[PDB]
Amino acid sequence: SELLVNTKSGKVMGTRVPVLSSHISAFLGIPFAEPPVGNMRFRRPEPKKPWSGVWNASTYPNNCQQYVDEQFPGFSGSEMWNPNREMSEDCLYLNIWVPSPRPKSTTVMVWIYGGGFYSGSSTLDVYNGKYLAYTEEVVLVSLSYRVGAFGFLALHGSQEAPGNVGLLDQRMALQWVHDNIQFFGGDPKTVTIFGESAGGASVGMHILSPGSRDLFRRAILQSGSPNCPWASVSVAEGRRRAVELGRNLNCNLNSDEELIHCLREKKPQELIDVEWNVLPFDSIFRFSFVPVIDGEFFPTSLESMLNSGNFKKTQILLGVNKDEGSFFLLYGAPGFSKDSESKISREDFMSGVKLSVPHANDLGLDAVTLQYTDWMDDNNGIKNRDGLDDIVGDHNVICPLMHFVNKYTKFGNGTYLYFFNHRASNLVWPEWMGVIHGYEIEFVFGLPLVKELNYTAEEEALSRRIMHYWATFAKTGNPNEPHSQESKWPLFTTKEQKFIDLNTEPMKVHQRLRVQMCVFWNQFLPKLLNAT
Template identity: 45%
Template sequence: MMYCKLSFITMVCWMFACKGAFVHSDQNHQELSSYPSDDAKQMPNDDISFDDTIASLDDNLAAVEQMEEEKYVHARDTNSKYGADDDPLIVRTKNGRVRGLTQTAATGKVVDTWYGIPYAKKPIGQLRFRKPIPIDKWDSVDPNFILNATKPPNSCIQNIDTLFGDFAGADMWNPNSPLSEDCLYLNVVVPKPRPKNCTVLVWIFGGGFYSGTSTLEVYDPKILASQENVIIVSMQYRVTSLGFLYFGTPDAPGNVGLFDQLMGLQWVHDNIAAFGGDPENITLFGESAGAVSVSLHLLSPLSRRLFRQAIMESGSPTAPWAVISREESIRRGLLLAKLLGCPHSPNSIPLVVDCLRNVNASVLVREEWVTHGVCDFPFVPVVDGEFLTCHPKDCVRNRDFKNASLIMGSNSEEGYYFILYFLTDLLRNEEDIRITRQDFLHAVGQLNPDMNELAKQAIIFEYTDWMSPDDPVKNRDALDKMVGDHHFTCNVNEFAHAYAEAGNNVYMYFFNHRSSHNLWPSWAGVLHADEINYVFGEALNPKKRYLPAEIDLSKRMMRYWSNFAKNG
């Protein structure tokens, strides 16, 4: 159990770089914009007029609205046999041709998009719980067949969050495309004019391995791709028990959600050149469980050759929720089987899997929350001996990882989001929440149910402000730091430190800007995942009416991320 007190300098987005050592002072501060680069790769001008920025965006708004109705002009409603090879929206992949569409970002810039390209066979029927199988060529029967890739793909089966009703701050993370087990698809967004040997960023979404989808509005890549002239790829992968049930057999090997990602990465490496991308310059980036996934690809001997560097937002493989033991994963799987009325003896695993394979997928995931601690997500990666050959802590200790440049960081209030879902009576979604000393002491036990009394007392001692132990605001904020440090911030720092000591370039950020669009109570501060809107450029959408300083912040973050991807 490791907790830590933060010592970051407080500013909107603070970054430092190090090689061979973990830097702790401003003396060694180095911004990502210090990379040798041409004008196209420079940071936005610090003297830029915010009024000019808004005026320029407003000038584009009318054009954006006019083009909105026409953005699907290049798409066909169904898969087609017809289409000329000189059509730039028809791309020949190793599996066959795909037809995309031209879209306009909210800024008025244009991109070409291919939605829902299949990268594996449908994981249904007997393939449920199994590793993905490469998809067959779709033009093997009819060489004239062209796959229509103009509609967002299905989201993988998961539960819908209804705890806060239609509250937009929570509902924004619910899937916005149909739920289905048939979900192994990826999306490619390419700037126009079509580049050659373009830098590629592959986004892996988060969601605790129990939720998430690449199609969320907050992940819309059109602004980032067009603004920074990079190709953005995003993929669906199986979550919940459908992606992470483990019994150590070919029928339920575990980590199949990670194997989905691996197959998606292999597809990108094999095919992205046809879209104008450079297969030797691929950067993975992800947030939360997506960041954990990225870090596990750094550790996996199967993934390392498929990308060059990585960006991890609020996630590390050494987080306590990131990887569980095989024994614990089997225990959870058998408990799920019991709840569903299936055989649940450890001596009858084939019968257990066969029964679970025939349960309706929606019923399966509805019953699977078999854990009881905060951030204790039920079905997550395991050390399976194939994708993961060592526990992340051991991999890090032995430096058994891909040497690569990294960006890592966390937000100032990482814990509140999860406490809001866990202690629903104590931390309600309303203003002016205060926590008495007695409630604080009780909450420590609720948040850490598996800890012994000595450990709980150590946590209380560490996170109590002993100058004012009864302060209800400080007690409330201590709960956030307790959860955020343990589950996110400390392990991010730990992983970054290990990578830097191995001689790698490690760039860190600390995000503490509370967005003017944040819908949660003001005391919740800068929540887990709040930086995503700025990374993908939502602030540049004039319809959203972000503040001028927020537009500038988003431009800077997009430039930091893309310059890193381009230059390492």
């Protein structure tokens, strides 16, 4: 049967699923690791012990234990990101969508979800891989990984809670794809890993980590890069936060053994209830448990790795959205609300900048304020709101990504950069938030192709173009069709730094994406903060 596949781990039984008036195969909830429960919590993943019989892969698996956003109960805008399956520590599974009839050896795309390393699920509706698998005829895989303390509590030195285990979960899933995707008709030598936000940072981290490089061919990064200020911490900070977590749960802090043992007896929700209390500053776009520069997964600092060319060299396709920062200001900066235009006063603006650049002293805060203020109209509420929006987006996503792309392009074999600036017609979030963090995903996964979702004809056309760019890049390392008549997405070169916009209007080529502000965030500010 087309729904029965024999893998090196055992036999699996999928299910036929409808898609755009047709059908394809789906293998949901395939385990790739042993459940990381009990004494296994915080530990490196362990390969799934082979099973006899047939594994039923007809239903989605549980989502990993995580913080659940309840800011807007019932609002689809925020709940579309919450886990849609019961949560459990037994959550290391992957999902595969296979074209029908089953291909013999086609392009593979593995999706890595985002969520600030503190949340995320592979089962979200916006991540349904059938549309992309069916439309572009690629084998689409979505993996999962532990988030929060469960996946990133770091007590460097101990082997019971080494840190980065969530990244190792991802790697093991990639190892499984490498070893078994051939049986599903996928070609293991043509695997493209792609992800958004923390998922994009993750993709970049696998590009850097020597132990991950060999497991994939090409990479796509959406609104995220490994060097983002929120994507990693030092082993000292990681240790400080883990101890602080134990302190919040009345744990014995005499030794890592005592601390770890205590954290292991706690129920998942107990750790999650105090997760945000360990942050060192009053901030936004900062998460408690994230990857640590351990000297193992990451041999040295990310910066020195980027400078020496210590990373996988291949082709990459990456980009950002126009208003990456709005989500984080809505949720944590004073003055921003979901149902108002959120015109920001001067006082709230400054409160926002301190929150956005929590690691800066007063001189640094002034530098930022000066850089983003129109002194010819400093009391303009719209201008203060948008300026703060740009500050958060430039500092946390865009500039870190531009630094990465410029460093990578020096050693890489091909780079394609995009700027997503189309605001969906059916967007439920307020207008002031613009092209929101995470809203290019629905186009990448082809949601606009399903009429019931209410997108326009141009948006469906845009989704098809993007899906074809992504899939074509995955297949050849170039988003453009061989000898096509369509407009060409120019290669991003170290000299010309070209990129394109991604919207319903005719393609436009630009250069030096937000170079003015990124010279500030990547060159000046760090130099200023260090000199003081």
